[PDB]
Assembly symmetry: C2
Homo-oligomer: 234 residues x 2
């Protein structure tokens, strides 16, 4: 299993079905509508991974027939926040599907994230964050890439989604086709709001250079690099 | 002379001084604060070109001492709009300076614009438009790249400015370093407001692909391609 949940109260049940497809019964959403899931490992292979945000049974694209997620207590998650709480980087080599009600989707891993032929299904917005979520008394306040020089890598097989895409990291190295409704890439050492407004920035001690190679198939692309002196190479 | 003014009432006086530096005494601004200058040819070499938007004499960076521009009638231009009204494409191989009061600067040429080691001095915003300005009863209404498949090219020697930069064309092919406070690149066949809000778009009959190669030295980059199906290659 590529995805290994944390042992604690934010660890969802993760099961393998079929020929290796992972099914994640995400944890009960809080009052903000956030399903906050914590992981020791978060990796996706070509069989893909399905996050059950369904209030009634049905057919998933990647895992066939699934029952409803009864953790949801009749209310689907608005945001599925997946947080790696170990030192293990993430490798995403297949599709990630939200089964049931469309939601916003976040993966945070301050140790690094690599995408190569990964994608997102039934998400309104998907965000990859090489950094940590920020909490105050149980409430999500935003995200941080402070004190971090690690990499978001996008491989030759690219990344695809029909929804919005955010790429958030100290630096980004992309070598493949990125397909999305909109692409927002924010680089450097920053604190963010929940909506990825930049609230503060550090100047890195050494250059944090990002590289984008290959096509971007999107009608709207924004690249913001706050590392003063550092550049974006295309 | 690389810059040749139109014979008509929007043709400014253009003089060569020194070792080839061109000095353009821009035409009297209208009530909108726009100095609308029309040209048979608009090309800049390494000696550069200076647009006199000065209310009093002084030292220009590119052309040494210049007197005030008495066409200004005591009011400097807010926008210096340079429009090529012939079929000749533009080649910009040196710096363009606004002498005197800082202003917004536009070059429109629907036949194509090539930059290679060009730059902009004392401009708050500089825009290169492979397209035409739109007028209604003498008033600037915006810009158009409709019915146009021509190219904005940026060469290996790049483009530099301390101000904002807009790159507007059916397609863009960039091979060098672009340095600016912010970079906005809008591609495809579009109509624009004066502030380059996209108001309408055509689908080209064949793909209008843009290519960005090399660094972008800017903290904020926006790329908007309205040609449905067409991509942006980095």
């Amino acid at each position: 299993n590529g995805i290994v949940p944390d042992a604690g109260h934010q660890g969802p049940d993760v099961s393998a079905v079929n020929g290796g497809t992972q099914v994640i019964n995400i944890v009960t959403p809080n009052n903000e509508g956030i399903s906050h899931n914590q992981y020791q490992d978060f990796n996706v292979g070509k069989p893909g991974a399905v996050f059950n945000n369904a209030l009634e049974a049905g057919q998933s694209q990647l895992a066939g027939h699934l029952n409803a997620n009864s953790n949801l207590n009749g209310q689907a998650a608005s945001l599925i926040l997946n947080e790696v709480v170990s030192r293990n980087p993430s490798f995403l080599l297949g599709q990630q599907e939200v089964f049931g009600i469309a939601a916003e989707f976040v993966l945070s891993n301050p140790n690094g994230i690599t995408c190569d032929g990964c994608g997102f299904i039934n998400t309104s917005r998907s965000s990859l964050v090489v950094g940590n979520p920020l909490f105050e008394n149980g409430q999500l306040k935003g995200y941080s890439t402070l004190n971090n020089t690690n990499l978001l890598s996008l491989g030759k097989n690219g990344l695809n989604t029909t929804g919005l895409l955010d790429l958030i990291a100290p630096r980004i190295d992309s070598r493949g086709k990125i397909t999305a409704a909109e692409i927002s890439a924010f680089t450097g050492q920053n604190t963010f709001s929940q909506h990825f407004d930049i609230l503060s920035s550090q100047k890195p001690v050494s250059a944090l250079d990002s590289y984008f190679f290959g096509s971007m198939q999107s009608g709207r692309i924004r690249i913001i690099n706050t590392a003063e002196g550092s550049g974006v190479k295309l």
